[PDB]
Each structure stands twice: as structure tokens, then as C-alpha cells.
Paper text:
pmcAcetyl-coenzyme A carboxylases (ACCs) are crucial for fatty acid metabolism, facilitating the conversion of acetyl-CoA to malonyl-CoA, an essential step in fatty acid synthesis. The BC domain initiates the reaction by carboxylating the biotin group attached to BCCP, while the CT domain transfers the activated carboxyl group to acetyl-CoA, completing the conversion to malonyl-CoA. Mammals possess two ACC members: ACC1 in the cytosol of liver and adipose tissues and ACC2 associated with the mitochondrial outer membrane in the heart and muscle, whereas insects and other invertebrates have only one ACC gene.
The solved ACC CT domain is full length, spanning from amino acid 1622 to 2396, with approximately 175 Å in diameter. Both the N and C domains extensively interact with each other and with the ones from different protomers mainly by hydrophobic interactions and salt bridges. Additionally, when comparing the buried interface area among different species, single-cell organisms tend to have a lower buried interface, while human ACC CT exhibits the highest buried interface, with T. ni ACC CT nearly as extensive as the human ACC CT. We superimposed their structures onto our unbound CT structure and found that the interacting residues are largely conserved in T. ni ACC CT, with a few mutations that did not significantly change the pocket polarity. Our results show that the majority of the structure is largely conserved; however, the C terminus of the C domain (residues 2180–2230) in T. ni has elongated alpha helices. Additionally, we found that the CD domain of T. ni interacts with CT at a different angle, deviating approximately 45° counterclockwise from the angle in T. thermophila and around 30° clockwise from the angle in H. sapiens.
Author numbering:
A (entry chain A), B (entry chain B): 1622 to 2199, 2215 to 2396
Write the structure that this text describes.
């Protein structure tokens, strides 16, 4: 046979056979080596063996423990196969372990039954307790459906009239000789009824000697769902869909939250035939309408799409290259193929542009990140926000940016409703919508679970606040970004690019004060920020009376006319009296000339309105500049666009090394005190001032290169200041802990403790 | 004055003045006493003082610490007032503390300036560090906007031509004598430019000597947002909106997650005039269209709506009556007014009905919960799922139920788009939709933060799987119920009512195996559950061949006709040969009568098709019953509907006592070992078997009443088994901890420890 029929069935339905899955990983690892050899991320020759596989088999009955074996392919007795893989990758050359779980389409169409479910449970438990990432490939038909067959070949029917069966039947019963066979196995729950002239066993309930018929599959489905949620919280989970995912398997896919879909796949819950039976007419013609690429890639369930299974393996290893090898380690930092001292020569223009060109480049005018390092995940969903992963100097970075072009969104028709039609929606550039805000929160959550540093490029003028968007819950998804930023496990760096604006509640969302431990903000010299735009501040705070006062203060003709009116009023006050009323007549003339004075001082106040309106707008715009943001303390430092790469590289590297040593200091003090981040940073600063001196102690804040090189120097040596002081601090913490717990003891136990431990 | 003008301004705009806010709580507490005296939940007379208020004032400059004072009303220098209130409620008669935060409309329209932000920050920190609930009242105009006024008074312009100002201006500048006055205060960043014949100071930037003008309010707004998110995770937060909530305040409202809205309120992000200025025409005529009750109560941001501020205070204290007084205490259990031994006489019918009637009653045929205890929160949003709070025997319970009637949903028109029209959508009864699933997840989260027991009434046939609901992210909101059930902090009891079905992936969502520590499942005798409905299992697993085999096995005419065809086949086999071919003539007649035999055995197989289809449907329906679910282990016990109240009361009380004593056992061991729930329950069972006996040890599982009375008996006495063994295990844990932390020490340090203890 040599596994030919299983391969034929899997290839005919469109799936790589399960025991041919690991070798694909091997090939892609080899390809990465060759590409890195062309780029210079690694320089060594490719190793002879790049993958070592050990198969995990669960014990059947004792305690269902996981036993690692090496055996020939094709010997499975259940519907999933799991391996542990050691991969010798360019980013991790010594070794790196993952756990791979895959279904079997040759075994009952990949259905979910209990013995299949315990394999997933124990493999995900193994991946969680070893803290290594998990990759699941889904080829499934859903939960297992079954009908008991020993009763099916033996049940009898109680008729109203035996001559005419078409009228109806009363109950389903078993004869006594059938019950003599089936009574021991516990397949039926029955009642002894003497109807007509014979003893009959009326079937009340049907049970099976076999398992997997009914709700016992759905009991372990919730076990998989809870374990997949727990694995999402505790490790990095990647899911691949190749042919189909029906029902509960789809939920496991969404409980992975990182989904790669082949172009011929579908992720559905209810099949199209059942929906046409419910709706009564042939509404749907395929399951690709319900759950294909054009639905799941455009709503955000499927992150990336791949043409084949091998390309999906390549995308999975690309995503795995960014994350650390386990939860106790630092992110994989490659070598510097692209110089960090190079200029960033693609400047973001004021007009509408493509933000991916400022991150990658346009075959000249090189951009921010490394050449070719950029990978974006949810492209056709919520295209206002661009979310992806890249590398800066070899350091993995999560990237969020804002498209400044209008987005046309086509909402397709619903074929269940005849009146429904497709619609075109125009979405503005720099505005969070419900989908864009939910995308941003999802991206921050997914980068926070993998401990990836996030750099956000901030260009927002606010939220959407129209009636349709207020009905579509903009407040909820706006709050989810605040919660996601609050649950950050990595440094977050917000940077305002040239020509970008950060206004309104968007500043309140992305401010460093949401999570002060993990967030910083920087701005370009040509960056604007404020509560409102300039026209709104002119409407609310610099109104018509101020404009007219400005005209009477700075216009020469209005000054001279006002002086004329004042002298006329003095001429009124001096000439109070006036034969009788002889001096009256000139007063009348003066009144007309005073009407020539107040008028034509109104013609100047209407001719000069737009120019002092532009003075108002300029005066409002001078409050929005970067130097006021630096002086008020809202931003940390002003970084130019041309020198952004080097400075952010050294700052990110300094924060990574500093956070690692702060975790070591908090680990050392654990018996005595629960130490926060600030005392740990102060302790490292005190060791820095002890090692260097009081003259060079300012460089802890200013120089981000000297601190990082100092940390990498002091971490290696065991005669260093840092390691010796960590050992001394740990011993003092042990002393304080033992002192407290011996003061908490009783006088009776204390004497036993002293005499037994002084007896030695 | 006696605060008359401030009350006039607040009452004219429609808001209760801030120093009249506490007294309302007083009145409502008094009302509750009278109502409870009529019901019998309390018996004692009403206390003389039911509320004690102490005002919290932040220090201005030293460390911004909270100082508690008692002073005359009307002396605020900031726009927020905060108090700590001791309330002597019927559920908590001894005392109960909350923290109340309220804005001031009389102080700059309730705007958010930095000092107000620090009052909110420090008051919420006080509420979190005392672990007591927080109530906030939102009367706000948003973030504070400002313009520097000295530069506004004294700026000058540089003209292209001074004779004609209308052509344009070059820059905004200051004269030297103005710069001599304003140089020391740091209001301008300028450059010395000699243009024309005079020295000029070209204003590059404008800064203010005052604060609150710009982005610093947006900086402290993120501080409020992060603290409000943290307070949502750590304590219970309730928010009330009375006149308006604009901008960041709205987000704080959503970060409370429990919202009471007055009928004249609005919760908006952008005003109507700004949206009409963007859209260019008069689209909106009010802010009630963007943020009123008809939007927020129908999308789910506003939980409850109240006609006035007094009724909102009543609703807030109603919600506060369910939750415990602090995070270290057990839920308030009132006295038994309605007897727990009464029958539940409103049976849920098979037809479409109102699920509120089985929970409350219909002025006869009393329902499940207490009479009048039911309070539902989100009524007009996602009306498939009914979510609320009630009381069982005095115990607070969170309630989730399923409406079995078709819901008409009216989607209103969008005034921005001219082609938009209103739509009517029909939603089925027993199906999770995106809004219904998101409502269920929100309800489980809000009940889990308050440590309230949840009882779920499970009647679902699955999820919605059409193309429109797949595009509207059904999987995303279906996974959130699994995550919310996984993050449960309280006992969860799922019960299938009579006449209810739990089918498909809904069972996988609400199974006990998602969170086995906190979830249980029970079912009525007349309850159905399965993977699919019976017709689908007939399509998949009882097809045409099995039906025809059943006809040939159980129908008499087919049995006789098959025997006839068999005998004619034997007559074919015997007559092989056949003057020549003399016996061939009977073979033709046999062929005709064999064709007459095979036909009319096909007429019987088409006449009998519907009746054996009903036999197939009945045989499939017999697998879905309750006793199969009990025998397979999926449900815990079968509980009838008439006796559900007593049994669920005693089980819930047993779990509530047992979890508290398990937490005491895990607290006792904590120096030595981190103990899970299972060893704690086993330890309590071993103490139970030690006290009672080896014979009466089954009652730990069967009799909940005996376990309740045993735990409540030995919680009080200090000579009991439980208290003595807790002290013994704590002392042994201390001894083991000291032994281990001495064995981790160095030899030189150990000798100093020995001599310092032996010196005593």
C-alpha cells in the first residue's frame, strides 16, 4: 500500500496528507536560509538538519498522559496527529520548538469525537506548560454525528391497525428475544407493557454501546474551546484553514485569533443546504458564499490568505519569526543588513498618499523600516487603519498607520431578502470608524500577547460621530483601544509623522498617561495637535467682538474715524446752549456729518472681515505647534523624520535591555518585597552612577546608546557591578524573609527550630 | 446668596445642583426601608440616620493626597465634588461605604480641566484602594478649550501693504515694548527680525501663562480613561448621565459599563453644528438625534433609562443592593419573604410565550424567582436574549433567558444619505445573532465583575449562519461568550426549562467543560438536546436504503411478495432445459407474472414512504431525551420545574458557603503551597468525615441542606473541627516555609541567624 490510498483521497479532496505536513516546514526553513544568505541576516552555512520531529501520542486509559515517540507514519488510531518540532531557523540558529496539531480527513472526514478531542486538549496543555507556540491546521467536518445501530436493525413498530400501516403508529418497541440480547449492553431504557396478547418492551430511551453519537461530542467541544481560549491568553497560537472548517472547529479557528486561509477554503457554521431548507427556496448555491475568502478575509476573521498549503506554511513561519521562542525569552533580533545610519528619504507629503510607501519605499527614496521587512495582515478590512509587522534594525516591531485617502467600501447584497441591493460607502481618511477602531484594538491585543514592541504612526482628526456611526457603537470600540493599550506587555512608541494631525479624543486614547509604564510619545517638527481644529476655536473662543476690537486697534482709518467721532461728541458736550437758539443750526449739520462718521466706519468693518478672519485662523494655528507640546510636557522629545530610524532603534534597544534587567531585579527581591518598575529603574541608575561616576550620570536619560552598551557589557561579566549586587540583594531579601517568618512563629515551635537546626 | 443663583442655573439647565445630590440617596434609602417593612425582608425600625457623608478634598501641590473633611456646601475651587458615603441600607444594616463623584455645571459648564482630572483620578484611586464601589454623575461639556489672552490683547500684524490691508499679511509679530512685558512669563517663542526700519519679534509659537488651553487636558483625559478601565477591572462602577456627556466624558461613561440615562440626556462625541458644517447642509437639527435615549438605549450603551435624577438614584441603589459591600465580602442575602418551598406553577408552554412570565408571574401561577425581585437592564436592544438581575430566597442572581417569539427590528434611516430608507427585520426566537451574542457576553462580564451567581435558562437551536450574519462577524461575538464564561468569578448554573432545546454549537458554548470550576448543568425531564435536529439526522444517518430495509423487515405484504419472487427464482434455476423446447412455454408466463411480482412491490414501497419517514424521525428523536444526557454524564441531575426553586436555592447556598471556606483553606496554606480548588474541597470533605462519621459521608454530594447547616454551624464556633484544623495547617505551613528558606541560605549567614535567635 505504502500509504497511497490515503494520499490519493487527501489530494483528491484538496488537502496535503497529514504525515506529509512536517516536511513542508523543513523546505520553508531551508528557503529562508538561502534568502538570508543573500541579504546578510546570517552568514553561516545552512545546517545539515533543520527540523527534528517527535510524535506525541496520548495514553488511552491510565491518565491520558502525553508520551513522545518516534514511529513510522500512518499508524494513527485517532483523527488528529500532533508533533513537537525543533526548527533551526535563521533568527534562532541553536534551536526552537513548536507544537503542531493537525486533523485527518482520511479518518471519518475529520470529525470531532471525544478521543480526537483529548489529543487536542493534551497537546495544547503540553504547549502551554512548555510555553512554546502552537500551530493548528483545520481539516474538519464538525462534531461527530451518530445513530445507534443495534436497535436500528431490531426495532419493531406498534400499529393502530396492522392491515393498514399508513394510518399511524403508536410506539416503537422491542420483542423479548431482542431484549435478551440487548439488555446487558444498556442500549435501551424500556418499560414492560402487555399490549394485545404479547409482552412488549416499549422503548422510552435509546442509548448506544458506542460513543460519539450525540451530546458527548459537544461536552468535549467546550473543553477544546476553553483550552483554546486559555492558550490564547498564555501562548502564541496560529491557525491554518485548508479545505473546510464547519461548526465548532470554526470557533477554535477564531479562538486562535491568527488565521491563514487557503483560497479554496471555507469557514462556515451551517451548511448551505440546511439554510435553503429553512428559507424554503434555493437561496445559496455554495458554501463559499457563506464562508469563503471574500467574506472572512473582508470581515477580519481570516488575517492572511495564501494560494496553497505550502505558502500558508511560509506565512506561518514568517509570523513565527517575529515572536520569541518561548515566553521566558527576548524577541529574536537579527543582524543589521540595512544600515541604521541611513537617511529616511521618503517624506510624507501634505496631500493624500499611500502610507505603505513611507514604511517600505518606492524603489528609490528609502523609507523608515528595513527593505522588504514589511508584512501587513488585514489588508481589505477597515482600510483606514494599516496594521502589520516589520523589523527595525533586526528588532521585530508592530506597526499601526493611517491611510490619508478616501476608501470606497462595497457592501454586497443579501440573497435571502429580495429587496436588498449592493451599496457604495465613502469612508474618510483620518477618522476612526467602528471597523477601524475594532481593527486597532485587535492589532494591539495580538501584538501584546506576543510581546512585540508597537510603533504607532498617529494621524487622526477624531472619531466618527454621525447618527449611523453612533448607532453602530463607536463608543464601545473606542473604549476597546484604551483597554488594549492598558493591557500592554511591551514598549509602545507613538510618533506623529510630518504633515500629521492628532486632534480630539484620539489624543485621549493614545496618550502615554493611559499606561505610563509602557507608552511614550514623540513628534515631528512639522506636526500639529490640539483640542479642536482652528476654525472651531475661532467660532467658540475668538468671536465677532474680538475681531472688531482688533480692527479698531490695528486699522489706521478706523483709528482716525474714531478720533473724529470722539471730537464730534466733545463738540456736542461743549455746545449745550443754542436770538433764541442762535447756535442751533450748525448742530444739525454736525449731526449729519456725525452720520457721515458712524457710517463709513461700518463699511470698513465689512470690507475687512475676511482678512482678520485669516488673522484669527493663523492665531489659532500658532497654538497647535510642536514646541508648545514639548514645553507643556505632553511629548517626550522632538525627532526629525530624516533621523528617526537611528534614534528609535537605539531607544527601543535601550528599553528592551533595561526591561530585562528590571525583571531580574524584581525577581531578586521576591521573598522580601513586591517591587514596582520605578524602584528597579532607580536601582539600575544607582548601579550606573556607582560604576561610572557622578559626572557622567546624566547619560541615563540623554544617551540611549551608552546605556544599552553599558547594560550589554555588565550583563556578560560575572565580576560586574550588576551581578554581584543582584546576588547581595537576593541574600538580604532571604534574610528579611526568614526573620519575618520566624517572628510569626509560636514560642513552642521556635525552640524546636533553634535546637534542631543548631544540632546540625 | 445662600447658593440660590447656582441652584437657579442648574435647575434652569435641568440638573440637580451638586450639593443637593447626596440627600437624594438618603431619601431613596428611607423609601426602601418602608417597602421592606411591608414585605418582611427586614423587621427592625428604620434608623434615625441612614447616610453619613464626608467630603474628599485633594491637596493642591504637595503630593495631591486625599484629605477627608466636613465643611459647608458651596466652597469648591474645582469643577468636581467627591464624597464618601456610609449608607445604612436594608440589605446591609450595619454600614456600607461608597464613593460618589459629580461634576459642577456652575463651574465653566462642567468642562474637563486638569485639576478636575486629578480629583477624579485620586477619588477613583481611593475607591479602588478601599475596594468599595464607585458612582459617577456626568454633567460635562467635554475637554476645556482656551486661547492665550495677553497675546490676543497685544499682537500686531505685518502687512504686504499698509495702505491696503485686504490683500494679505505676512506674519504675526510683537513690538519690543510688548515683548518687554511678556518675555518673563514665557507666552511667546519668537525670533528677532529687523524688517523695514524697526525691530520686530516674529511669533513662532504661542504658549500660555495659564493652563487648560490645549493638549494638556487631552493628556490628563487619558489618565482618567486608564484609571476608569482599571476601576472597571477592580471594583464596581456605576455611571449616571443627566443632561449631557460630550467627548471624553462619554468614553468614561462607557468605561463604567453600567449606565443610567435620564430621558432628556444625550451622550454625543461631536455636536450637530460641526457635523452640518462638515456635510455642508442642515442634516441634523438636534443632539438628541445623535446621542439621545432612542439611540443609546437601543444600541446598548445606556443600560437603564430613568425619568428624573431621583429615579436614577433609585435605580443606582437598586443595582447596588445586589453587589457586595466590598471585594472581600459575600453577596447581601436578605431574609426569606417568599417561601422557598412554594410550587413553581407557571409552566413554560411549547408554543411561543413571554419568558418574563416564568420568572415573575402573571398575577396568579407564581413563577421561579421572588415576587417583584426581577429587574431587567437592556430591554429594547437584542431582544432575543433577556438579561437581568433577580433574587432567589434572598440571594442575588444574574439571569439570562431566551425569547421564543419573533422580534421585529426597525432600522432607521440615515439623514446624511438621501437614498437611505428605514427597514424592518424579522429575527427568529431561539437563535444567537451578533447583537444577541454580544449582549450575552456583556452580561456575563458585568455579572462576573460583581461576583454575582449566574443562572442561565438554555433554549437555543444554534447560531445564525447566513451570509449577512457571517459578514456581520457572528464568530467574533460567539467566541466572546466562551471567553466570558472562562473568566467567571462566581457559580454558574445552566438549566434547560421544560419545552426547551439545546442543539448545535450552543451546547459547546454553554457546556460545563468551558470552566469546570464554576459551571454546572441541569435539565428538565421534558428537555431535548442533540447535535442536530431530527430531520437532519434522518438526512445524514437514516437514508433511503435503511428505510427500504425496514419496509422489507416489518411489512407483511412485502414479506409475502419477496418469498414469491424467491420461489419464482428457484423455478428459474430448476427449469434450465426447455419436441425441442417443449417446456419453454411456461417460462414466458412465469416471466410475465414475475414482472407482476416485482411491480406492486414497488407500489407498496412508494405508498408506505411517509409513515416510515415518521418512524425514522421518531427513532431519531428518541436519542435526544434527558435520561441519555444523564447517563452519558453531560448533565449533573434531572430537576423538575415544580421543585426547581427549593433545589437550586439549597445548591446555590451550598456553593456560596463552600467557596468561602475553600478560600480560607487556600489562604491558610499560602506560605508553603499554592493550593487549587480540588484539594481544598477534599480537605473540607475529610473534615466533614472526621466530624460526622464514615457512615454519613455520601451527604457531601447528595444533601446540600446538611452541608449548608454544617458549614454555618462550624463557621461560628471556635472549638469546632474547621477552625482548629485551619490553625494547625497554617502553623505547619509556616514551619515548612521557614525550613525551606533556611535551607536556601549560605553557611556563614546561617550561623549568625542561629546565634541571634539563641541569644533571644
Amino acid at each position: 500500500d505504502y500509504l497511497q490510498q490515503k494520499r490519493f483521497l487527501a489530494t483528491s479532496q484538496g488537502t496535503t496528507y497529514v504525515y506529509d505536513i512536517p516536511d513542508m516546514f523543513r523546505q520553508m526553513v531551508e528557503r529562508r536560509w538561502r534568502e538570508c544568505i543573500e541579504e546578510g541576516s546570517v552568514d553561516g552555512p545552512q545546517p545539515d538538519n533543520v527540523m527534528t520531529l517527535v510524535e506525541l501520542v496520548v495514553e488511552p486509559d491510565g491518565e491520558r498522559r502525553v508520551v513522545e515517540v518516534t514511529r513510522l507514519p500512518g499508524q494513527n488510531n485517532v483523527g488528529m496527529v500532533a508533533w513537537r518540532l525543533t526548527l533551526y531557523t535563521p533568527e534562532c540558529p541553536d534551536g526552537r520548538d513548536i507544537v503542531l496539531i493537525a486533523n485527518d480527513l482520511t479518518y471519518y472526514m475529520g470529525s470531532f469525537g471525544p478521543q480526537e478531542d483529548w489529543v487536542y486538549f493534551k497537546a495544547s496543555q503540553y504547549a502551554r506548560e512548555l510555553k512554546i507556540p502552537r500551530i493548528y491546521i483545520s481539516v474538519n467536518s464538525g462534531a461527530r454525528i451518530g445513530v445507534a445501530e443495534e436497535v436500528k436493525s431490531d426495532f419493531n413498530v406498534a400499529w393502530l391497525d396492522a392491515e393498514r400501516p399508513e394510518r399511524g403508529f403508536k410506539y416503537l418497541y422491542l420483542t423479548p428475544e431482542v431484549y435478551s440480547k440487548l439488555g446487558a449492553l444498556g442500549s435501551v431504557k424500556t418499560e414492560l407493557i402487555e399490549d394485545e396478547g404479547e409482552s412488549r418492551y416499549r422503548i422510552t430511551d435509546i442509548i448506544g454501546k458506542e460513543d460519539g453519537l450525540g451530546v458527548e461530542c459537544l461536552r468535549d467541544a467546550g473543553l477544546i474551546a476553553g483550552e483554546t481560549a486559555q492558550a490564547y491568553e498564555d501562548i502564541v497560537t496560529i491557525s491554518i484553514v485548508t479545505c473546510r472548517a464547519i461548526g465548532i472547529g470554526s470557533y477554535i479557528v477564531r479562538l486562535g485569533h491568527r488565521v491563514i486561509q487557503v483560497e479554496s477554503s471555507y469557514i462556515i457554521l451551517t451548511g448551505y443546504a440546511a439554510l435553503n431548507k429553512v428559507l424554503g427556496r434555493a437561496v445559496y448555491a455554495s458554501n463559499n458564499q457563506l464562508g469563503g475568502v471574500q467574506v472572512m478575509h473582508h470581515n477580519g476573521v481570516s488575517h492572511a490568505v495564501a494560494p496553497s498549503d505550502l505558502e500558508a506554511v511560509r506565512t506561518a513561519l514568517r509570523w513565527l519569526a517575529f515572536v520569541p521562542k518561548d515566553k521566558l525569552s527576548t524577541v529574536p533580533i537579527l543582524r543589521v543588513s540595512d544600515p541604521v545610519d541611513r537617511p529616511v528619504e521618503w517624506k510624507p507629503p501634505r496631500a493624500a498618499h499611500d502610507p505603505r510607501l513611507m514604511l517600505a519605499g518606492d524603489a528609490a527614496r528609502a523609507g523608515f523600516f528595513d527593505v522588504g521587512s514589511f508584512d501587513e495582515i488585514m489588508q481589505p478590512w477597515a482600510q483606514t487603519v494599516i496594521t502589520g509587522r516589520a523589523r527595525l534594525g533586526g528588532i521585530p516591531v508592530g506597526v499601526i498607520a493611517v491611510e490619508t485617502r478616501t476608501v470606497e467600501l462595497t457592501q454586497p447584497a443579501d440573497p435571502a431578502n429580495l429587496d436588498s441591493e449592493a451599496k457604495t460607502l465613502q469612508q474618510a481618511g483620518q477618522v476612526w470608524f467602528p471597523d477601524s477602531a475594532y481593527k486597532t484594538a485587535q492589532a494591539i491585543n495580538d501584538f501584546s500577547r506576543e510581546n512585540l514592541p508597537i510603533m504607532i504612526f498617529a494621524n487622526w482628526r477624531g472619531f466618527s460621530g454621525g447618527q449611523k456611526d453612533m448607532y453602530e457603537q463607536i463608543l464601545k470600540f473606542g473604549a476597546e483601544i484604551v483597554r488594549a493599550l492598558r493591557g500592554a506587555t511591551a514598549p509602545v512608541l507613538v510618533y506623529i509623522p510630518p504633515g500629521a494631525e492628532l486632534r480630539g479624543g484620539a489624543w485621549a486614547v493614545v496618550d502615554p498617561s493611559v499606561n505610563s509604564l509602557r507608552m511614550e510619545m514623540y513628534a515631528d517638527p512639522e506636526a500639529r495637535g490640539g483640542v479642536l481644529e482652528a476654525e472651531g476655536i475661532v467660532e467658540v473662543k475668538f468671536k465677532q467682538r474680538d475681531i472688531l476690537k482688533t480692527m479698531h486697534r490695528l486699522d489706521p482709518e478706523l483709528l482716525r474715524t474714531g478720533a473724529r467721532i470722539s471730537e464730534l461728541k466733545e463738540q456736542i458736550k461743549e455746545i449745550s446752549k443754542g436770538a433764541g437758539r442762535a447756535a442751533e443750526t450748525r448742530v444739525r449739520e454736525l449731526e449729519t456729518e456725525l452720520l457721515a462718521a458712524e457710517k463709513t466706519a461700518k463699511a470698513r468693518e465689512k470690507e475687512l472681515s475676511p482678512i482678520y478672519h485669516e488673522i484669527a485662523v493663523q492665531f489659532a494655528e500658532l497654538h497647535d505647534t510642536a514646541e508648545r507640546m514639548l514645553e507643556k510636557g505632553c511629548i517626550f522629545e522632538i525627532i526629525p523624520w530624516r533621523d528617526s530610524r537611528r534614534l528609535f532603534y537605539w531607544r527601543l534597544k535601550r528599553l528592551l535591555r533595561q526591561n530585562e534587567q528590571e525583571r531580574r531585579v524584581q525577581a531578586a527581591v521576591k521573598p522580601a518585597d513586591n517591587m514596582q518598575q520605578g524602584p528597579a529603574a532607580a536601582t539600575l541608575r544607582r548601579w550606573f552612577t556607582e560604576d561610572r561616576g557622578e559626572t557622567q550620570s546624566h547619560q541615563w536619560e540623554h544617551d540611549n546608546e551608552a546605556v544599552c552598551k553599558w547594560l550589554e557589557a555588565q550583563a556578560g561579566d560575572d565580576n560586574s557591578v550588576l551581578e554581584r549586587n543582584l546576588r547581595a540583594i537576593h541574600q538580604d531579601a532571604l534574610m528579611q524573609a526568614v526573620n519575618n517568618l520566624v517572628l510569626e512563629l509560636t514560642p513552642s515551635q521556635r525552640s524546636e527550630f533553634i535546637r534542631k537546626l543548631s544540632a546540625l
